[PDB]
Design an enzyme around this catalytic site. Structure first.
Site, PDB file in Angstrom:
ATOM      1  CD  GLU A  35      -3.084  -0.870   0.026  1.00 45.52           C
ATOM      2  OE1 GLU A  35      -2.958   0.096  -0.773  1.00 45.52           O
ATOM      3  OE2 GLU A  35      -3.974  -1.756  -0.060  1.00 45.52           O
ATOM      4  CG  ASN A  46      -8.933   6.006  -4.633  1.00 44.87           C
ATOM      5  OD1 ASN A  46      -7.970   5.300  -4.918  1.00 44.87           O
ATOM      6  ND2 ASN A  46      -9.371   6.149  -3.400  1.00 44.87           N
ATOM      7  CG  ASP A  48     -14.072   7.160  -5.701  1.00 43.71           C
ATOM      8  OD1 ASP A  48     -12.921   7.567  -5.461  1.00 43.71           O
ATOM      9  OD2 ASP A  48     -14.754   6.668  -4.813  1.00 43.71           O
ATOM     10  CB  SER A  50     -12.364   8.544  -2.429  1.00 42.05           C
ATOM     11  OG  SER A  50     -11.880   7.433  -3.161  1.00 42.05           O
ATOM     12  CG  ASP A  52      -6.836   4.914  -1.191  1.00 43.80           C
ATOM     13  OD1 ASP A  52      -8.022   5.069  -0.879  1.00 43.80           O
ATOM     14  OD2 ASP A  52      -6.464   4.007  -1.922  1.00 43.80           O
ATOM     15  CG  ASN A  59     -11.295   5.117  -0.407  1.00 47.47           C
ATOM     16  OD1 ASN A  59     -11.577   6.278  -0.459  1.00 47.47           O
ATOM     17  ND2 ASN A  59     -11.573   4.243  -1.447  1.00 47.47           N
TER      18      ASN A  59
HETATM   19 NA    NA Z   1     -10.327  13.070  -1.787  1.00 48.02          NA
HETATM   20 NA    NA Z   2       2.713   6.374  -2.183  1.00 47.74          NA
END
Ligand code: NA
Ligand code: NA
Ligand SMILES: [Cl-]
Ligand SMILES: [Cl-]
Ligand SMILES: [Cl-]
Ligand SMILES: [Cl-]
Ligand code: NA
Ligand code: NA
Ligand code: NA
Ligand code: NA
Ligand code: NA
Ligand code: NA
Length: 129
Positions: A35, A46, A48, A50, A52, A59
Site C-alpha cells: 500500500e 482514486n 472516484d 476519494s 487513500d 480511503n
Molecule cells: Na479526496
Molecule cells: Na505512495
C-alpha cells in the site's frame, strides 16, 4: 515517516494488530508494504475522487474526512490527515474497524492481490517482537 520492516511490525504488534480478527502480523506488514512502502505520508487519488491515506492507504470514501470527497462517510471519526502521522495509532485503530466490516482484509485490494495466500510470515522473519 518511512518505517523499517521490523520497526513497523513491532509498532503494529504494540497497537494490537497482531492476529487481530485472525490476521497474523505478517499479513498487516505485507499490506502496508504494497500500500505505502511503509511511508506514513503516502497519499493516492482514486478515480472516484476519494483519496487513500497513510501506511494502509485508508480511503476517504468511508473512513476519514478530508472535506473533498462528496457523499462520503467518516466512520473512523478522524481527519484523513491523522492517517499521515509518524505515530500509527490512528491508522491502526481505523484499520481494526475496516477489517471488521465483513470482508476481512479483502477490503485492501492490494492485500488480496499480493499478500493473500502467500508466505506472509516472511514479512516478520528475523524481527525481534
Ligand atoms: Na479526496
Ligand atoms: Na505512495
Ligand atoms: Cl522490505
Ligand atoms: Cl505472520
Ligand atoms: Cl468530504
Ligand atoms: Cl476474515
Ligand atoms: Na520520510
Ligand atoms: Na481471519
Ligand atoms: Na503523499
Ligand atoms: Na493508513
Ligand atoms: Na499511516
Ligand atoms: Na467525510
Amino acid at each position: 515517516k518511512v518505517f523499517g520492516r521490523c520497526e513497523l511490525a513491532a509498532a503494529m504488534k504494540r497497537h494490537g494488530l497482531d492476529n487481530y480478527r485472525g490476521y497474523s502480523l505478517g499479513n498487516w506488514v505485507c499490506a502496508a508494504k504494497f500500500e505505502s512502502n511503509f511511508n506514513t505520508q503516502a497519499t493516492n487519488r482514486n478515480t472516484d475522487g476519494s483519496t487513500d491515506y497513510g501506511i494502509l492507504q485508508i480511503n476517504s470514501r468511508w473512513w476519514c474526512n478530508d472535506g473533498r470527497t462528496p457523499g462520503s462517510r467518516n466512520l473512523c471519526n478522524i481527519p484523513c490527515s491523522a492517517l499521515l502521522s509518524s505515530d500509527i495509532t490512528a491508522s491502526v485503530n481505523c484499520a481494526k474497524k475496516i477489517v471488521s466490516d465483513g470482508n476481512g482484509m479483502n477490503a485492501w485490494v492490494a492485500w488480496r492481490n499480493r499478500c493473500k495466500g502467500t508466505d506472509v510470515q516472511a514479512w516478520i522473519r528475523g524481527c525481534r517482537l
